Structure formats: structure tokens, C-alpha cells
Amino acid sequence: KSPLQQEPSQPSPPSPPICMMNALVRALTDSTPRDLDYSRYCPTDQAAAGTDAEHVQQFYNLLTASIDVSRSWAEKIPGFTDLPKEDQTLLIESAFLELFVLRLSIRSNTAEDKFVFCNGLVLHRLQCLRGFGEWLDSIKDFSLNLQSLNLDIQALACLSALSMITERHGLKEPKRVEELCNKITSSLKDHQSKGQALEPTESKVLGALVELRKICTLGLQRIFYLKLEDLVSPPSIIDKLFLDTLPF
């Protein structure tokens, strides 16, 4: 009598408003040290006296703390949990080095040649030169460029989420990760329109994004040689990350 065909053409009322930008910023502000720790901070530190083995030990200890902080950072993000369990794990492991570098560069001061970690620990430049070496130096150069961009708090919050969220390879539903990426870009996009220019600085971000990626692969390269040496052998979590992640 009355058959149905074609699309329903339902307007579909808009979803209720969400403070997406605020949530990202809130998480970003809490994951920063206040007390600060300069007990081991020194103006001069030459690579010597167990430089390799001791520094390598320091390297994993810092990352172990960094990844837990990164996890909490991801956990604070709204809609992060909604993604499959495996997706959330894949995103964290792949983006752990990127988040550490990105967050470290923002917090660090290139003019002062000092690096401030999310734990408040400061390793100047030479202190991390023992292992990172030229790898650290690249981060300092990257940080200077990043500072030039400025990137407000809200803009920065979306970008850190953007770095964390991206299509990998054996992803759970590429679209789950992409869905979240679009969500971050939605908040971010309105942020870029807030300024008088109304021009998105994403293109500038992508140029620094490639450089950021170079650091991510550089981190893998440095540790690859150190692991062959096996000065102290990486922890299960960090070694797991290396094997789980791929250079491609």
C-alpha cells in the first residue's frame, strides 16, 4: 500500500555542545611539573665515567615515566577510550617517542640549552649528549622552530592530540583513529578562525611535523645501535615498544 524507497532524508538534529578544546588543554596543563627538580642539573657535564651505561639507564627510566604520563594524557582526552582497546594501545606505543619529543621541546628552552621533562627533571644539553648526542641537538633546533610558530595553548592541545592520533598500518578501524583526528581538527579549526587572520597554520605544522617525525625515527636509530651493545639492556615495556613499532 505504502512502500518505502530512497534515503530517509532525515535532518538529524545536531548533537549537544562539547568542551573538546578545554578537555585537551586541561590534560595538557596538569601533565606539567610545578616543583621542578634541578638537584642533578649541572652547567658543565662531559661525557665520561660510565657515560654510556649510566646514561642508557637514565634513558629508559625517563621514558618509563614519560609513557605512563603519556597514557594518562591519552586517558584524559574525551572519546579516546571509545576507540577499540587495541587501537588505544597501538596509538600510545607508536606516538610515545613523538609525544616525549614534542612535549619536551615545547617545555624546553633552546636559548638556555636546557630540557625540562614532564617530571620536572632538567638535563641541560650536554648531560643528555652522552646518549642522545646529536639526537638531542636536533630536538633543540626543532624546539626553536616550534617556539617561532607560537601555537596558543588551545592550538597546542589539539596538535599534541593530532600527533598522538594518526593512521598507522594494522590499525583497529583506520576510521576510529581518523574519527578522533577529525574531532581534534574540528576544535582546532574553530580555534584557527578565532584570530583576525582566520588562516589555519596547519601547513606550517606539517613542515615541522615531518621534522618531528625525523626525530621519532632518529630516536629508534640511536637505541638500535645501543641495544646491539647491550650496555644495560632496555626494560620490557620500552624494548616491547621498539619491537611493536616499525620504522615505516
Domain containing 179: what range? 37-244
* 8 A C-beta contact, residue 192 and residue 200: yes
CA distance 57 to 214: 24
SS3 category, 109: strand
Neighbours of 73 (CB within 10 A): 23
The domain that holds 66 is classified in CATH as 1.10.565.10
CA distance 126 to 142: 17
Query: Residue 54's closest CA among 231, 223, 218?
Result: 231
* Domain presence at residue 28: no
Q: How many structural domains compose the chain?
A: 1
Q: Which residues contact 151 (CB under 8 A, 6 or more apart)?
A: 159, 201, 205
Query: Residue 185's closest CA among 210, 227, 155, 207?
Result: 155
CA distance 112 to 211: 22
* Domain presence at residue 181: yes
CA distance 5 to 214: 53
Residue 62 backbone dihedrals phi, psi, to 5 degrees: -65, -40
Q: Which residues contact 97 (CB under 8 A, 6 or more apart)?
A: 215, 216, 219, 220
Residue 35 backbone dihedrals phi, psi, to 5 degrees: -65, -40
DSSP 239: H
CA distance 54 to 68: 22
For the chain, give percent helix, strand, coil, nearest 5: 60, 0, 35
* Domain presence at residue 14: no
* Domain presence at residue 29: no
* 8 A C-beta contact, residue 239 and residue 245: no
Q: Which residue has the cell 629508559?
A: 60
Cell matching residue 13 = 538534529
How would you label 28-63 residue by residue, b for 16+ Cβ within 10 Å and e otherwise? beebeeeeeeeeeeeeebeeeeeeeeebbebbbebb
Distance of CA 15 to the CA centre of its chain: 30
* Domain presence at residue 179: yes
* 8 A C-beta contact, residue 163 and residue 74: no
Rama region for 207: left / alpha / beta (φ>0; ψ in -120 to 50; rest) = alpha
- The experimental technique used to determine this model is NMR
CA distance 176 to 172: 7
CA distance 182 to 185: 5
DSSP 116: B
* Domain presence at residue 201: yes
The torsion of the CA quartet 188, 177, 169, 243, rounded to 10 degrees, works out to 90
Interruption sites in the chain after residues (C→N beyond 2.5 Å): none
DSSP assignment string, 20-65: HHHHHHHHHHHTS-SS-B-SS--S---S-SSHHHHHHHHHHHHHHH
